[PDB]
Design a protein around this ligand. Structure first.
Ligand SMILES: [K+]
Ligand SMILES: [K+]
Ligand SMILES: [K+]
Ligand SMILES: [Mg+2]
Ligand SMILES: [Mg+2]
Ligand SMILES: [Mg+2]
Ligand SMILES: [Mg+2]
Ligand SMILES: [Mg+2]
Ligand SMILES: [Mg+2]
Ligand SMILES: [Mg+2]
Ligand SMILES: [Mg+2]
Ligand SMILES: [Mg+2]
Ligand SMILES: [Mg+2]
Ligand SMILES: [Mg+2]
Ligand SMILES: [Mg+2]
Ligand SMILES: [Mg+2]
Ligand SMILES: [Mg+2]
Ligand SMILES: [Mg+2]
Ligand SMILES: [Mg+2]
Ligand SMILES: [Mg+2]
Ligand SMILES: [Mg+2]
Ligand SMILES: [Mg+2]
Ligand SMILES: [Mg+2]
Lengths: 243, 54, 254
RNA sequence: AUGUAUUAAGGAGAGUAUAACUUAAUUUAUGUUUAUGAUAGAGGUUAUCAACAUAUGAACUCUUAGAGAAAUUACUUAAUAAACGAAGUGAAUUGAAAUAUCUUAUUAACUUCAGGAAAAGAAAUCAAACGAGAUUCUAUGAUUAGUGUGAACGAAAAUAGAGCAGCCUAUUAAAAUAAGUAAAAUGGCUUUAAAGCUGUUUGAAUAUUGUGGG
RNA sequence: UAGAUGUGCAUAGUUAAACCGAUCAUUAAAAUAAUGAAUAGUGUCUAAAGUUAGACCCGAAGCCUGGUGA
RNA sequence: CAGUCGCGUAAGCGGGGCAUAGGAUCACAAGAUACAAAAAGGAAAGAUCUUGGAUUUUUGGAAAAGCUACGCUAGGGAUAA
């Protein structure tokens, strides 16, 4: 009658409860499904125990190692970037930066060591955009530039991305200048903000520098190279000829 | 500061941790330019990076 | 239709003065007994205290000495006096203070909230009145009570009588189930009236209402503002990208 | 059982209006409100027919001067439990299907010292090329990095919450900025090989104008 | 008023691993030459479970530490 | 299938022996791979491939001698007088 005396869950939601050792006609009495007087009835068997036979992890050993230094990149495909621009969830008229990529829901809700653009759906991508990520595939770079757009790969960290979304750091696709001829214009730009902003870090390791220093990745340090210089900090392009 | 009578350096009256707290507290109130020289000042940290670099 | 009307009456005379419009997904949802169940059982779990405690054989007082020799006595071998087989032993699987609370997604709890309002709306058990919802006690009694002329005994005996004959005339008293008044803030007359005469109904503040409270009495008498605030805080499954939330169709004839 | 608040030495013996508590064992006073209280009588043993608040007399013996067979002696205005804290010392049952390394375990326990709490504490700290900013408690991070033949053991950064406080002129009275010290070899502890603790034998430097530690 | 904020899982696979990437790995150069691996998750409730804790219940002989007793 | 060598006029054969009787991981040692490199440049210590030394003979792989009639506990009558 009363609504509160008529509520229930769906019948399929309810499952039988098994109370063991409560009589013979229950089907689980006097042994509770254990058997007759074995180790499995008196006590407990270790889970890693196989009776004494050596496990395969010992007879064969553990293979390989786990890379604790590899960066965890958020993978973004052109197939998905196009689906967002058409739906109106990403503005193609403005620069597409990690802040706009994270706040769009296109890579999810988890921030990781970086964002990499991949080339799934490169045949149907024909929207001119100005995107900036940490890495990009050789297929995505051509698809973005073939449609009349621009792409730049910049160095980021898991902490830098958080500050970008939080608004504590302003985005910039250029490295910090070096020299006494830029200290003034850079200090003035900071005073004009009237708010404490954290700088975006630049690469420090050999690999990270070489990555953003070559034009194949459209790295934001590639402008520091000469037309004949190599991105590597150690290797050089040898010379051809008879000498 | 090096004590004149005893040739021993005296630790600064404010540790590098307490120096950064004043700079942070003085920056949130607009009196950072009233503090003496400090390697924790936001302009000095930035100037040393732009001038010299990595 | 995507929207449903909501009439706003003047509580004393119940004169329909204004007309608002809400979404069908607010006050016209289907009756889901399984979703209302999960919400009602979810609130009871959180209300439970869960402090019962019993002692095990590892907490019962006494020494852990061996009672009888292992053999030679002709009796059954025994270990400690705190065994469950012994007189004052410890209950093996007895109650312990734990958390009986369960989880329920904010979107399911918000659907169960609007489903309870829709159950009352489609049945005519949801009466929306204008703000200022309080029992119109006589001015003479109100003047005496403040003055201090009336004793506590007589002051409470009058409120119990007036509230009774008042609810019985409106067919809102114990005979017709009961009524639950929901207001945004506490009101002296309303709350004091049903604190002394609770058989005729009860009054609650919007912050104290539960899904179960929207299904106990015979009617829900809620204020225009409390309803709008009640639905605005329990539509997580709707405003995610809005719908009509208090759209005034007919304004009060000032 | 949990939470909140307050407090920070505990017991015994014998005696006594058998609700009344210390040989005074039911002391003597003050103020206010007293049925609209508080939350126009009878009644001093045929008693305490008054609650709140503020004062006040009395309050024995032992633990507890010395001594002794505690509650005695002999003297005298003799007087401080437990638990919790820190350091020192430090197992075994147990698990590994035996068992030594390991685990159990910087555990239990014991000793010393200390207070109502104690301890710790304002970076010779962490981070990583951006920055954070003492200590303490809880959760996540984390059946992770890592160690170990195994069984198993096991962080930190960071995050969230509880609290938040900085200083040396320390709100209680301290430094002329630290040499047998840092560090090394060796024997151990801890541990990831670093850092940290340490017996023995040796043994530095002077500040970002780049001195010292990490 | 506005802004930011708060574990996690999934969204792309591949390899010992990174680079790489709808492709990746082996081929000491590479190359459809060959072989393997590609498409709905997430939260809650009910119930049954694995793991660690006393772990379904009762039961040793013994080992260690501190105390007691001539 | 790729690589590149031998024999053969050629077709073709060849990834030891007419067939059936030689144990891993771990650690260690020697070569290659260019993977990662705990601030950074290096390195150390690791990872992958090839290879070597075993009555690991209780040979799916513990570094291991006895007495008890002074004996004890849990069990078996699943094996005795
Ligand atoms: K015992
Ligand atoms: K060092
Ligand atoms: K992946
Ligand atoms: Mg089933
Ligand atoms: Mg059966
Ligand atoms: Mg079974
Ligand atoms: Mg079963
Ligand atoms: Mg049986
Ligand atoms: Mg069995
Ligand atoms: Mg009991
Ligand atoms: Mg339940
Ligand atoms: Mg004495
Ligand atoms: Mg005495
Ligand atoms: Mg073993
Ligand atoms: Mg590990
Ligand atoms: Mg010093
Ligand atoms: Mg030292
Ligand atoms: Mg060391
Ligand atoms: Mg040191
Ligand atoms: Mg390095
Ligand atoms: Mg064998
Ligand atoms: Mg075999
Ligand atoms: Mg004999």
């Amino acid at each position: 009658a009363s609504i509160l005396a008529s509520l229930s869950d769906n019948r399929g939601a309810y499952h039988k409860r098994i109370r063991k050792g409560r009589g013979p006609s229950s089907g689980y009495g006097k042994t509770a499904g254990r058997g007759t007087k074995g180790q499995k009835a008196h006590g407990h068997v270790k889970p890693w125990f196989q009776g004494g036979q050596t496990p395969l992890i010992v007879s064969h050993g553990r293979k390989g190692f786990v890379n604790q230094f590899a960066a965890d990149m958020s993978e973004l495909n052109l197939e998905k970037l196009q689906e967002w621009i058409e739906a109106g969830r990403i503005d193609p008229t403005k620069p597409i930066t990690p802040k706009e990529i994270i706040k769009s829901g296109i890579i999810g809700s988890s921030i990781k060591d970086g964002i990499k653009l991949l080339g799934r759906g490169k045949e149907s991508f024909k929207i001119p955009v100005t995107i900036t990520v940490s890495r990009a595939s050789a297929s995505a770079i051509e698809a973005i530039e073939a449609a009349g757009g621009k792409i730049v790969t910049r160095f980021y960290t898991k902490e830098s991305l958080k500050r970008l979304v939080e608004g504590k750091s302003l985005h910039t696709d250029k490295p910090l200048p070096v020299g006494k001829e830029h200290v003034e214009e850079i200090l003035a730009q900071a005073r004009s903000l009237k708010k404490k902003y954290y700088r975006l870090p630049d690469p420090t390791s050999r690999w990270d520098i070489e990555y953003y220093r070559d034009p194949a990745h459209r790295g934001y340090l590639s402008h520091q190279l000469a037309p004949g210089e190599s991105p590597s900090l150690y290797f050089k392009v040898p010379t051809g000829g008879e000498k | 500061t090096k004590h004149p009578i005893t040739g021993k350096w005296h630790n600064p009256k404010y540790s590098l941790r307490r120096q950064a707290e004043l700079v942070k507290l003085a920056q949130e109130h607009g009196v950072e330019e009233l503090l003496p020289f400090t390697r924790k000042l936001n302009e000095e940290k930035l100037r040393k990076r732009v001038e010299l670099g990595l | 239709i995507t929207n449903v009307p909501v009439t706003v009456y003047s509580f004393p005379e119940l004169e329909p003065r204004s007309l608002e419009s809400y979404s069908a997904r607010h006050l016209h949802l289907p009756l889901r007994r399984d979703i209302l169940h999960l919400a009602v059982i979810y609130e009871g779990d959180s209300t439970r205290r869960g402090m019962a405690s019993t002692k095990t054989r590892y907490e019962v007082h006494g020494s852990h000495k061996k009672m009888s020799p292992q053999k030679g006595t002709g009796n059954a071998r025994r270990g400690t006096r705190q065994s469950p087989l012994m007189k004052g032993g410890g209950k093996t699987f007895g109650p312990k203070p734990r958390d009986f609370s369960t989880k329920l997604n904010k979107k399911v709890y918000d659907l169960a909230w609007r489903t309870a309002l829709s159950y009352r709306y489609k049945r005519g058990e949801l009466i929306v009145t204008e703000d200022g919802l309080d029992l119109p006690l006589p001015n003479d009694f109100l003047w005496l009570a403040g003055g201090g002329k009336l004793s506590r005994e007589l002051e409470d005996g009058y409120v119990r009588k007036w509230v009774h004959e008042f609810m019985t005339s409106l067919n809102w008293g114990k005979e017709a189930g009961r009524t639950t008044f929901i207001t945004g803030d506490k009101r002296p007359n309303l709350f004091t009236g049903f604190e002394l005469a609770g058989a005729e109904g009860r009054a609650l503040e919007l912050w104290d209402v539960d899904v179960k409270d929207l299904l106990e009495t015979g009617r829900i008498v809620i204020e225009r503002s409390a309803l709008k605030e009640m639905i605005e805080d329990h539509q997580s499954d709707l405003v995610t990208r809005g719908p009509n939330l208090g759209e005034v169709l007919v304004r009060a004839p000032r």
